[PDB]
Amino acid sequence: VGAGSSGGIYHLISRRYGPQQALKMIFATQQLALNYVRNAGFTVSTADMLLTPEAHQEVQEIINELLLESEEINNRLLHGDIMPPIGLTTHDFYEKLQLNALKFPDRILKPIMNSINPETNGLFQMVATGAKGSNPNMIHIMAGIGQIEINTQRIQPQFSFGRTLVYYPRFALEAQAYGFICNSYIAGLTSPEFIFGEMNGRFDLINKALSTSSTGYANRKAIFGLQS
Amino acid sequence: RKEGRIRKSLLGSQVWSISRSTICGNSDLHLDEVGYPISFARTLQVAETVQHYNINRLMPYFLNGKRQYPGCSRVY
Amino acid sequence: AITIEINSTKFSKLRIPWYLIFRMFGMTGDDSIIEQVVFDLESNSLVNTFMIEILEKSIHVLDPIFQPVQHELNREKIIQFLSEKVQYLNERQLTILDKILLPHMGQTADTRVRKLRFLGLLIHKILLVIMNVFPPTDRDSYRTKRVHGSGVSLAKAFKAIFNTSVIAP
Amino acid sequence: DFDGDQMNLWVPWSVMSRVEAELLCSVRNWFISTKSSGPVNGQVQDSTVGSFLLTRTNTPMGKNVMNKLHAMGLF
Amino acid sequence: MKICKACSSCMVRTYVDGNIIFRCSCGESVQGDSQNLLVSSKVYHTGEMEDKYKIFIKNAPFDPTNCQIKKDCPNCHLDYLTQICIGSQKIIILVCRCGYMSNRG
Amino acid sequence: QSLERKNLLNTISALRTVNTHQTERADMMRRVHASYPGYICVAQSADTGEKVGMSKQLAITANVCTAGEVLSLKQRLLSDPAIQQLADVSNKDIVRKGLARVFINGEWIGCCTNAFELAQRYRMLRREGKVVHPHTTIYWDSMVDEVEFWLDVGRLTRPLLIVDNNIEKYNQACYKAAEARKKGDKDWEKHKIPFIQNTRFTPQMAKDILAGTLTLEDLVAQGICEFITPEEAENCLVAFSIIELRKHKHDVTRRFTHVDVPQAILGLAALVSPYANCTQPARVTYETNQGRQTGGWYCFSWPYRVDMNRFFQFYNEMPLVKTIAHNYVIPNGLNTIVAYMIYGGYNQEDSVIVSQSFI
Amino acid sequence: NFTDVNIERPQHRKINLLPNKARLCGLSYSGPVNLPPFQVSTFPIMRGSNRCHTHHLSKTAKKEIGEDPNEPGGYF
Amino acid sequence: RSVAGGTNKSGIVRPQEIFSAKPVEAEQSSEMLLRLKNPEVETNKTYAQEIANSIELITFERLILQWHLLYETYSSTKKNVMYPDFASDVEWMTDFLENHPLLQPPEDIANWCIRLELNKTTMILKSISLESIINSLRAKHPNTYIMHSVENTASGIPIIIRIYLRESAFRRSTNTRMATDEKIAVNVVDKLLNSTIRGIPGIKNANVVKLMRHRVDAQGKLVRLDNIYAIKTNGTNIFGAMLDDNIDPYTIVSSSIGDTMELYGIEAARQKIISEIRTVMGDKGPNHRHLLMYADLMTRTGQV
Amino acid sequence: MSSRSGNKGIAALALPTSDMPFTEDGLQPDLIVNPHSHPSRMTNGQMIETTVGLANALQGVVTDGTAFLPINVQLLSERLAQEGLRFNGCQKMFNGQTGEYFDAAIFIGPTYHQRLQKFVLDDR
Amino acid sequence: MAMQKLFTYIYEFIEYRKMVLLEEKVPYDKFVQMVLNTGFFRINAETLNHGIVSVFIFGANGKYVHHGGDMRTLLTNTLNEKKHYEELILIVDKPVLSKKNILDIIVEQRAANPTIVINIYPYHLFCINIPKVSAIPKHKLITQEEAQEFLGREYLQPQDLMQISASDPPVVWLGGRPGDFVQIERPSETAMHAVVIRFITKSKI
Ligand SMILES: [Mg+2]
Ligand SMILES: [Zn+2]
Ligand SMILES: [Zn+2]
Numbered sequence A: 001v002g003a004g005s006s007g008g009i010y011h012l013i014s015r016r017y018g019p020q021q022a023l024k025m026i027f028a029t030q031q032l033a034l035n036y037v038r039n040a041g042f043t044v045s046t047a048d049m050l051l052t053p054e055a056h057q058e059v060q061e062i063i064n065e066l067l068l069e070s071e072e073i074n075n076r077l078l079h080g081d082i083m084p085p086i087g088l089t090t091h092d093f094y095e096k097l098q099l100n101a102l103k104f105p106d107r108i109l110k111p112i113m114n115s116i117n118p119e120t121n122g123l124f125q126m127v128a129t130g131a132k133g134s135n136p137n138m139i140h141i142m143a144g145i146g147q148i149e150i151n152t153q154r155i156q157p158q159f160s161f162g163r164t165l166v167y168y169p170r171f172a173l174e175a176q177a178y179g180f181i182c183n184s185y186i187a188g189l190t191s192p193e194f195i196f197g198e199m200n201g202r203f204d205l206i207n208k209a210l211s212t213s214s215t216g217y218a219n220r221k222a223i224f225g226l227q228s
Numbered sequence B: 001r002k003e004g005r006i007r008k009s010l011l012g013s014q015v016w017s018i019s020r021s022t023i024c025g026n027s028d029l030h031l032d033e034v035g036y037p038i039s040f041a042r043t044l045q046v047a048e049t050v051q052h053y054n055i056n057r058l059m060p061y062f063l064n065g066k067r068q069y070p071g072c073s074r075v076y
Numbered sequence C: 001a002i003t004i005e006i007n008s009t010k011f012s013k014l015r016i017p018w019y020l021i022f023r024m025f026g027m028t029g030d031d032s033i034i035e036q037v038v039f040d041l042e043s044n045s046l047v048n049t050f051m052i053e054i055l056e057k058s059i060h061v062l063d064p065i066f067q068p069v070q071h072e073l074n075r076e077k078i079i080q081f082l083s084e085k086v087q088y089l090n091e092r093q094l095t096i097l098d099k100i101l102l103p104h105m106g107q108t109a110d111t112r113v114r115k116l117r118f119l120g121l122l123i124h125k126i127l128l129v130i131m132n133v134f135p136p137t138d139r140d141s142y143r144t145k146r147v148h149g150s151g152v153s154l155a156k157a158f159k160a161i162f163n164t165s166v167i168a169p
Numbered sequence D: 001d002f003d004g005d006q007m008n009l010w011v012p013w014s015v016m017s018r019v020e021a022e023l024l025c026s027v028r029n030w031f032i033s034t035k036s037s038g039p040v041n042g043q044v045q046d047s048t049v050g051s052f053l054l055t056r057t058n059t060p061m062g063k064n065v066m067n068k069l070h071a072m073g074l075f
Numbered sequence E: 001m002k003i004c005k006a007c008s009s010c011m012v013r014t015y016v017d018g019n020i021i022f023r024c025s026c027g028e029s030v031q032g033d034s035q036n037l038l039v040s041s042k043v044y045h046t047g048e049m050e051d052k053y054k055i056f057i058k059n060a061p062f063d064p065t066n067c068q069i070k071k072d073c074p075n076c077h078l079d080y081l082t083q084i085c086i087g088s089q090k091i092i093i094l095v096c097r098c099g100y101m102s103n104r105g
Numbered sequence F: 001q002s003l004e005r006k007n008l009l010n011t012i013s014a015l016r017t018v019n020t021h022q023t024e025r026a027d028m029m030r031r032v033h034a035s036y037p038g039y040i041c042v043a044q045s046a047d048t049g050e051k052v053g054m055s056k057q058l059a060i061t062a063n064v065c066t067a068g069e070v071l072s073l074k075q076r077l078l079s080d081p082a083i084q085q086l087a088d089v090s091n092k093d094i095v096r097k098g099l100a101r102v103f104i105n106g107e108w109i110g111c112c113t114n115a116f117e118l119a120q121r122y123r124m125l126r127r128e129g130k131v132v133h134p135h136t137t138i139y140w141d142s143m144v145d146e147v148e149f150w151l152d153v154g155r156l157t158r159p160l161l162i163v164d165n166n167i168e169k170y171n172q173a174c175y176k177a178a179e180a181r182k183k184g185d186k187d188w189e190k191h192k193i194p195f196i197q198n199t200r201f202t203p204q205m206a207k208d209i210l211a212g213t214l215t216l217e218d219l220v221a222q223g224i225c226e227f228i229t230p231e232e233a234e235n236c237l238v239a240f241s242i243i244e245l246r247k248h249k250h251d252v253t254r255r256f257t258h259v260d261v262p263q264a265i266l267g268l269a270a271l272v273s274p275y276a277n278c279t280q281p282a283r284v285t286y287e288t289n290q291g292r293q294t295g296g297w298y299c300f301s302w303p304y305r306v307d308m309n310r311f312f313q314f315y316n317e318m319p320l321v322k323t324i325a326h327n328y329v330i331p332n333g334l335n336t337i338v339a340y341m342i343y344g345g346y347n348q349e350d351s352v353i354v355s356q357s358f359i
Numbered sequence G: 001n002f003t004d005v006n007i008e009r010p011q012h013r014k015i016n017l018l019p020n021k022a023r024l025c026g027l028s029y030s031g032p033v034n035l036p037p038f039q040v041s042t043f044p045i046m047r048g049s050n051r052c053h054t055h056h057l058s059k060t061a062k063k064e065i066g067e068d069p070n071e072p073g074g075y076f
Numbered sequence H: 001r002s003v004a005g006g007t008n009k010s011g012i013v014r015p016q017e018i019f020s021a022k023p024v025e026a027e028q029s030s031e032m033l034l035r036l037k038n039p040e041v042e043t044n045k046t047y048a049q050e051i052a053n054s055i056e057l058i059t060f061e062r063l064i065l066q067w068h069l070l071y072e073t074y075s076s077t078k079k080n081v082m083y084p085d086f087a088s089d090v091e092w093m094t095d096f097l098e099n100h101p102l103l104q105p106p107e108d109i110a111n112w113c114i115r116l117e118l119n120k121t122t123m124i125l126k127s128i129s130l131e132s133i134i135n136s137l138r139a140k141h142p143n144t145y146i147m148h149s150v151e152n153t154a155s156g157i158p159i160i161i162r163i164y165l166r167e168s169a170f171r172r173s174t175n176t177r178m179a180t181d182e183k184i185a186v187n188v189v190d191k192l193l194n195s196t197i198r199g200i201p202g203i204k205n206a207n208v209v210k211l212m213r214h215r216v217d218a219q220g221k222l223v224r225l226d227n228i229y230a231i232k233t234n235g236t237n238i239f240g241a242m243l244d245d246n247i248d249p250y251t252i253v254s255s256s257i258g259d260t261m262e263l264y265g266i267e268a269a270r271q272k273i274i275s276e277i278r279t280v281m282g283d284k285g286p287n288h289r290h291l292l293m294y295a296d297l298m299t300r301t302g303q304v
Numbered sequence I: 001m002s003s004r005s006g007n008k009g010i011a012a013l014a015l016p017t018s019d020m021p022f023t024e025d026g027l028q029p030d031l032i033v034n035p036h037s038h039p040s041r042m043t044n045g046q047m048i049e050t051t052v053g054l055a056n057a058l059q060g061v062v063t064d065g066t067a068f069l070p071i072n073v074q075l076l077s078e079r080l081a082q083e084g085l086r087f088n089g090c091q092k093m094f095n096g097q098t099g100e101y102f103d104a105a106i107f108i109g110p111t112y113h114q115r116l117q118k119f120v121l122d123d124r
Numbered sequence J: 001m002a003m004q005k006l007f008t009y010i011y012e013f014i015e016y017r018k019m020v021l022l023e024e025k026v027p028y029d030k031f032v033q034m035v036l037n038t039g040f041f042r043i044n045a046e047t048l049n050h051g052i053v054s055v056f057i058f059g060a061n062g063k064y065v066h067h068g069g070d071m072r073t074l075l076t077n078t079l080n081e082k083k084h085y086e087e088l089i090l091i092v093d094k095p096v097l098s099k100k101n102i103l104d105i106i107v108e109q110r111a112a113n114p115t116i117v118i119n120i121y122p123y124h125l126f127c128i129n130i131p132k133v134s135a136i137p138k139h140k141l142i143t144q145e146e147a148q149e150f151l152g153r154e155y156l157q158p159q160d161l162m163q164i165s166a167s168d169p170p171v172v173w174l175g176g177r178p179g180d181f182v183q184i185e186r187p188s189e190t191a192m193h194a195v196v197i198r199f200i201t202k203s204k205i
Helices: A009-017 A019-040 A053-078 A090-101 A106-115 A122-128 A135-142 A191-226 B005-010 B038-043 B055-064 C018-024 C030-038 C046-060 C075-085 C088-100 C109-130 C151-167 D015-023 D046-055 D068-074 E054-062 F008-014 F024-029 F070-079 F091-096 F115-128 F167-183 F203-211 F216-221 F242-247 F268-272 F281-293 G019-025 G059-065 H013-019 H045-055 H085-099 H120-125 H130-140 H167-176 H181-193 H238-243 H257-264 H266-284 H288-298 I044-059 I073-082 J002-016 J028-038 J068-079 J100-112 J144-154 J169-174
Strands: B019-022 D006-009 E038-043 E068-070 E080-086 E091-095 F017-019 F055-057 F100-104 F107-112 F137-141 F146-150 F156-165 F197-199 F225-228 F334-340 F351-355 G030-034 G042-044 H031-035 H064-071 H109-118 H144-148 H160-166 H196-198 H205-216 H222-234 I010-015 I031-033 I106-114 J040-046 J052-058 J087-091 J117-121 J138-142 J162-165 J181-186 J194-201
Touching (some): A009 A019, A019 D046, A019 D068, A053 A106, A191 F024, A191 F281, A191 H013, A191 H288, C018 C046, C018 C075, C030 C046, C075 C088, C088 C109, E054 E080, E054 E091, E054 F115, F008 F268, F055 F268, F107 F115, F268 F281, F334 I044, H013 H266, H031 H205, H085 H144, H085 H160, H130 H144, H130 H196, H160 H167, H160 H181, H167 H181, H238 H257, H257 H266, H266 H288, H266 J162, H266 J181, I031 I106, I044 I106, J002 J028, J002 J040, J002 J052, J068 J087, J068 J100, J100 J117, J138 J144, J138 J169, J144 J181, J169 J181
Parallel strands (some): F351 I010, J052 J087, J087 J117, J162 J194
Antiparallel strands (some): E068 E080, E080 E091, F017 F055, F100 F107, F137 F146, F156 F197, F156 F225, F334 I106, G030 G042, H144 H160, J040 J052, J138 J181
16 A cells, blocks of 8 residues: 555556546545544654663673674774775775674564564554564664665764774774764764764765755756757 | 756746645545645636627626636636 | 965956966075975975976976966066066065965064965965875865954945045045 | 655646646546556555454454454544 | 086986997086986886885884884883884884884885 | 744744855865764754754854954963973974974964973863963874974863873882782782762762852862863863763773763754654754744844844743743743644644644 | 053943944944043954943843843944 | 775766766776686686686786886996895896807897886785786887896895886987977886786776576576676776676676777666666666666767 | 753644644643654664653653763663553543544653754745 | 788678678788788678679778878779779778878868779677677668658658667668668667667767
């Protein structure tokens, strides 16, 4: 029933009975759905985004695994074990090595699903039915943000020579110094974690503004070459 | 340029008989229906030429004038 | 070539080669002019040698605009040609120069040596950047930015408005 | 969306423009996207999650059943 | 470099024809020895970093913003050492205030 | 620009806004630069149009410096026996003897035998606060060996609490333990002392600040906090909160120079949002935009004034969950009771159903 | 050369021009500058500064002249 | 998308390359997909890898540690006044002379020498012998004379080669005689440094990729093969890969419209435009007929 | 209208008092906000603010919810339970138009809301 | 390299053109030696209309591609032979195509003999079996009668059609002259193959 669903019921109604019938069927099925929730009720709560104390420990243990994997890569850098393959420098090999080690596993959903009652959780149901939101949104709220990536790379040390922020030392090797956010939104980000999220968040806002203007100039040139 | 005679005056146009407002949701409207507030409905007009087949339908509009809705405010 | 442009009402659109500005200020010897940028002529290490070769090629490059004085050691000739491009006239064009060239170091004839040392340091820093020793200055970092409001902004506008409305008539 | 968007509306007053508006530019003609050939419209948000709640087999209250009064009330 | 002793300028090369002959704006000429035959050169990505960061590496034990690691100094026996990672090769250099430098690079 | 009186928040943000006047340059100048935290609000910017990142707001503690007494510090530097004037040292002496170039407002005056020593000595003289003004910038460039003193107008400053170590006693005890180990004692480890780092800010000072009896000037004059510029911020290792400082209380590998207060990285408009760190930061930027266009008691002299397009809202409420921003801007808005629910599909796509009686 | 300067608080024809009077009447909250000493110039003053009539006034004193007692000023 | 060098697909760079019909050189993300000749060796990943290695362009300066344009000549009958640092080369320069009696230094030689030191680590990494380098340089530079050391020795003794310029190269500059012998000598260094030792010109990289393809079996079933290995190169040279015997010349796919047009014609360039736009459109792209409108409009004149 | 989390919204329905949903205690909303407005934009500060303000109203206090202050949503929910409400801020609620209770408990509580000064009479 | 591929595929081009060789094929070594010595290798073939088509293969470093006088001499000598001479094909390196003097002599002798078709092509035109390239849809020349009836049914002039160069690789292999019509069977992802007719226009270079 979703909008833009090719092969959905409304696309089929249009194919057999006409697009006007599909429009009338969208409205009619919409009224049925809305009149049902008029009795069923649907809500979202702060407790819908809250992990149980057992699942919060499970998520903490997962992140500690990612930090240890990042820490071992550092120990391979302290001892010079980092041997870049052909085509990449040691910095490039180390940076892509850290990005892979700090990626969340698929099993991060296990603590989230343990805390969630799927048949009653409004946040899960909105995500799971395609109404709004996605799985990364749910993980970020409940479990953890993970690694901030801008242009498929970590936070570059732009504050100073070898420094990402004033809160981190020069040539810091901790994953947190380069955009890894161990916290979730519900847990609340710290000051340096929040700054990295702002850089990533502002980056999306800039991309939205620049893409629309860049596409608009291309759109007009496309129109005039093709309008005839 | 964008403000020049070609792009602003020729390829675009400022027009009459048009309204603008904030949009909002109405689940009781069909997908091909738009909710038009009555104040705008009296501002914007539909030109109906009077003939034998529509004279009786057009009379209630003509009698209402500006005082009553559905009314009318002009005659050519 | 290394061409130094001073932005002013008189001096504009002219890109004086650096050694010419050094010689107009004194110490006509090219070895000392090189030392002002490299800080040491009897030194090893590849950055110093790369700087020295860079400055050599800069000196030897034929400037299409300053052809006659590229090799001149007569300081007065350099000052004169500069004046026409822009002894009492010899001093005045040199006297206006130091006021418009690094005024923060000073605006008097006793600051020419330190002005030349500072200019050599600036050329050295630009050469260090071209050697990938240092990155370009960050255009968005706030270490190199200042915020000006009310007091500064109006005074400069008052300064420009004061001469044209009071002094000019 | 309804976060402050504004849209223009003009009512065709001429007979030719009204015939054209009804037969050609009606939104029933844009139900299928010209760009992608797929449908543009469908349920969004409450109707997407409300269709799932309506048609799911079980509720926390047991079977997803309603009596005749509430079945009538849906229509 | 060759500096004209008459006017302290730099003499151009003018390789003519089996020998180098340095030429000045004075008309002065000093010819040239066997070491003047190096017209141009290039060494590829060799011999840098330690000299390029000489001042920075010397200052590292005193910069409070540099990362430090728990490791005894073999020279003065401090349990903490300043860790430096410079260059695209990510060279780790551990330095101490006493002067220990751990020259690996 | 025209002073828009949407509310008190709009006024004090319009006076706190910094203005900069399809390429990589356009992208880069609009980003959240890593030098912003504490000086420019990491959240506040326009959320729509080409003005994204073109408007910058000062962070809550960020101030703008006035021109200091350049000449007094310049004569103090010249008279300093540790600085050798330009007329005394040549370039060859500079490179050979390891001298560092000393600048004041970008003007190179003198050279010193130890850049770090000079910077530390003058930072101490600034901490005590008579001979060196607390708003002077002392930046030591360890990468090129220069010491820069800055006193020009237009510097962004923020106060930062100073962190103090026992690193000297820690080092002396380390030497004692090493010498005991070399002498042959089995218990040389007992000579080592734990490293301790802390801020001098105590809860009593917090109470006194709340009581009004302690001001920021007293904290500066007592050497508890000092003003830091982005130039000097590049010389600082800042603990982002007292929790981070307390966690590394005995970590000699992470020695902070200052400890931050996390709220200092936001402006007033961003600090209006409660639990902003629990929200997506882009939504906090949206709040910075929307907080400044809300009706209320826009001007307490509204009836005497003749205004255009100014809306005065009769009723305002303090938020039930207030933030630090509301101690400085009058709360505008109401603590509406809101039900997060589907009700007939009339609140879809960012619509709201309102109580007609509430209106 | 000029050496005699004094910017004075804004004046109205002389009576003290208050910021509210300037706003309602449409004047410019400007003060004269002296340059024998003479003066042909006026220079806009920032409300709340030492050159503004509201510099020393308290909350009630600000209220009596029609200014907002709570706003900081800093405008022209 | 990546922003790494070699393929600048960031932002709208690639759509502008398509829509503004930029030439091959103006492209910043050009690519080729090369199929190995015959299908039995196609599944061999190791075989595909060594074809990729032989395809990558190897420039002479890649194999060089350092080079020095010296001012010295060689006659073997005189002292020659050699550079003091490189006067030790005469130990093996005579050894080369007695080992290559057919390559005596000619009379038209110049006193412009280019002494280069080879990178033995790079030579063995790409499996390039000294004689392969020597033969390539002589074939492409008929107006030079080349001497070298012996490549069989172990580490610590470097591979040294000196190219001696001939007077024939200098006489070609009379039309541009404003450039002295120095400018010509430096000019030949750039040409010599950029000589192709191995590979296809323009192929900066060549990586083995696993292809999904369909084929019809003996039973007539259409099966999808997931074990097919091919070469994905950075940079486009359809003509260069057409001359390679290890590459199927009839299944070369380039991302460039300009190279497809010059090599294959307007109809293949028209199909390239459709495929190149469709790549930009993503998985939520428009109907195919809207891409036909773009390509047919852009190719209606017989040219892009 | 907007909340302090930046979630803008256009008011399009004015229901009378008898038409608004109400809890078993008669608490009824001033605004009905779609739950679908939360998940994408991740305005969890608004949820936490409602949770805290529910207990603030019943305790008769105003609490500091400044950013980067320590937050424990589990303890806030436990505080809700201690004030006599549910662990979540959800209550049994009745449809105002029909009197039928929703099968789900509805999250309802005080959230500070602001009127953005974009007026429909000015815009239209 | 280019020479062996050109040697193997020029005869495939001649056969695809439905032409019969007047001479006999030489081994590859003899061909490359003749290219290195004489500067060109000349292959003569006969069409169905008993016309003669001469193919000249010029080496990269030959004298002809460098000096226009030798090009003039060669072209004037071959064009004066007692042959029907339907066409002349000159295969050279691509950089030669950007050499103005060679182009000038080509166009000059083209004007000198209006009847004879003289064409100059790069190596890559004949370094592959162009019709067998997968990316190239099947081209075929259609008679003036088929084109005339197609245009009459469509109410089109030849100039309304989509255009194709006479130097297009498939058109070169077909032997399409300007003013002729080539029908292309193009694969389609919307119709599962399609047919267009393109008007052959003047050759580039
Ligand atoms: Mg919107
Ligand atoms: Zn001289
Ligand atoms: Zn030590």
